[PDB]
Write a protein that binds this ligand. Structure first.
Ligand SMILES: O=C([C@H]1C[C@@H](c2cccc(Cl)c2)CN1)N1CCN(c2nccc3ccsc23)CC1
Ligand SMILES: O=S(=O)([O-])CC[NH2+]C1CCCCC1
Ligand SMILES: [Ca+2]
Ligand code: NA
Ligand SMILES: [Zn+2]
Length: 367
């Protein structure tokens, strides 16, 4: 079997974005506890991430920005109000106790995973605490402070001429796209809701610039996309990307805010529909870093990432959930898998095929 390494620090669920903030790191602990109770620890290597250093983070981020994140605390915010404005910290990216440590552990898992892949010590590495795709070189954005994904891709680029990034979070992976927009050494592929929706980027027509022209791919979608519709475009697009780009490593952001029932997202994917993306990417037999992402209905985040860990291990697991420390969260049914809702799919067959056809025309422009 393909080998899987998995990163988790038992404090990650203790970082708290603040009362009423929808981002709940506790969801990572729920995920871990569920997959432990399913027995999946028997089949993979489990590591604690290191705390990523300033030196590691400044491989992408500016020194001033990282020094600020290392400095800012609830008790000294009054003294830092102008830096808070410059670095976009204090509102949707709040100041909280242990903010910097949270960044260090999230990032540590992603970079450590990348090193493992580079050293050919694993076939897949998993960091559900990562996937912070909105963070920018010198500013926080969209709940994200340090871009673990960009840092992990930079690590892979030490050994790999061509790295493929795939993002199935409901939001456009703008910070990752931006970092690599002018290079052909990373192709970014984002599927996301588009139409006056955060972050506002990821138009069909954003295809990269300079040497990077045609190395950014964006599939904009409407509310209510379902497993059938998503599956019919994901496999063909990734197949064509693989054929034309021929990457030697892949990073897959597995943001679960694209699931049905998400508190913030308006897609209608099941856990099986979402996990099909992991199965498709695995068929290409390339070194693969799987990262977390959004997701705000936390029972469904735990289900999603537990099932995707099982997919990585080629292990079926039963729909009947095992007893676990969060069992009451999974009522009323106590099953792993979720049903779609009755929401309308605004993505017509013709819309999906037309967008796919435009993306195929762009991919045919590769050498
Ligand atoms: O889901 C996300 C992003 C977060 C990202 C992620 C992944 C992993 C760990 C972490 Cl800590 C964060 C996964 N995608 N967001 C929710 C919606 N939000 C806004 N919507 C409307 C409006 C506004 C205005 C400001 S923020 C916002 C933007 C951020
Ligand atoms: O379960 S456990 O291994 O004790 C969790 C370790 N947490 C670390 C977070 C960063 C600061 C050092 C401790
Ligand atoms: Ca996306
Ligand atoms: Na690119
Ligand atoms: Zn998101």
């Amino acid at each position: 079997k393909k080998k899987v390494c998995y990163y988790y620090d038992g404090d990650i669920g203790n970082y708290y974005y603040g009362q009423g903030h929808p981002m709940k790191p506790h969801r990572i602990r729920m995920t871990h506890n569920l997959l432990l109770n399913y027995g999946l620890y028997r089949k993979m290597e489990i590591y604690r991430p290191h705390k990523a250093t300033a030196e590691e983070m400044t491989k992408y981020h500016s020194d001033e920005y990282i020094k600020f994140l290392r400095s800012i605390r609830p008790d000294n915010m009054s003294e830092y109000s102008k830096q808070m404005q410059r670095f976009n910290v204090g509102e949707d990216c709040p100041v909280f106790d242990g903010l910097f440590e949270f960044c260090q552990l999230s990032t540590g898992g992603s970079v450590a995973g990348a090193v493992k892949l580079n050293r050919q010590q694993t076939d897949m590495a998993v960091n559900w605490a990562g996937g912070l795709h909105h963070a920018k070189k010198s500013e926080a954005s969209g709940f994200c402070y340090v871009n673990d994904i960009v840092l992990a891709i930079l690590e892979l680029l030490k050994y790999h001429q061509r790295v493929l990034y795939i993002d199935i979070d409901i939001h456009h992976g703008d910070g990752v796209e931006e970092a690599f927009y002018t290079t052909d050494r990373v192709m970014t592929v984002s599927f996301h809701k588009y139409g006056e929706y955060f972050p506002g980027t990821g138009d069909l027509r954003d295809i990269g610039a300079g040497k990077g022209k045609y190395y950014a791919v964006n599939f904009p979608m409407r509310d209510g996309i379902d497993d059938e519709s998503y599956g019919q475009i994901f496999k063909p697009i990734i197949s064509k990307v693989m054929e034309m780009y021929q990457p030697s490593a892949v990073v897959l952001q597995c943001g679960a805010d694209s699931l049905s029932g998400d508190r913030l997202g308006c897609f209608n994917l099941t856990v099986k529909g979402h996990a099909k993306c992991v199965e498709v990417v695995k068929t290409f037999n390339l070194p693969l870093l799987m990262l977390g992402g959004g997701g705000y209905t936390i029972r469904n985040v735990a289900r999603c990432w537990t099932y995707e860990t099982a997919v990585a291990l080629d292990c079926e697991i039963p729909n009947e959930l095992p007893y676990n420390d969060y069992f009451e969260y999974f009522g009323p049914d106590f099953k792993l898998h979720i049903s779609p809702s009755n929401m309308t799919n605004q993505n017509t067959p013709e819309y999906m095929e037309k967008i796919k056809q435009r993306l195929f025309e762009n991919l045919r422009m590769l050498p």
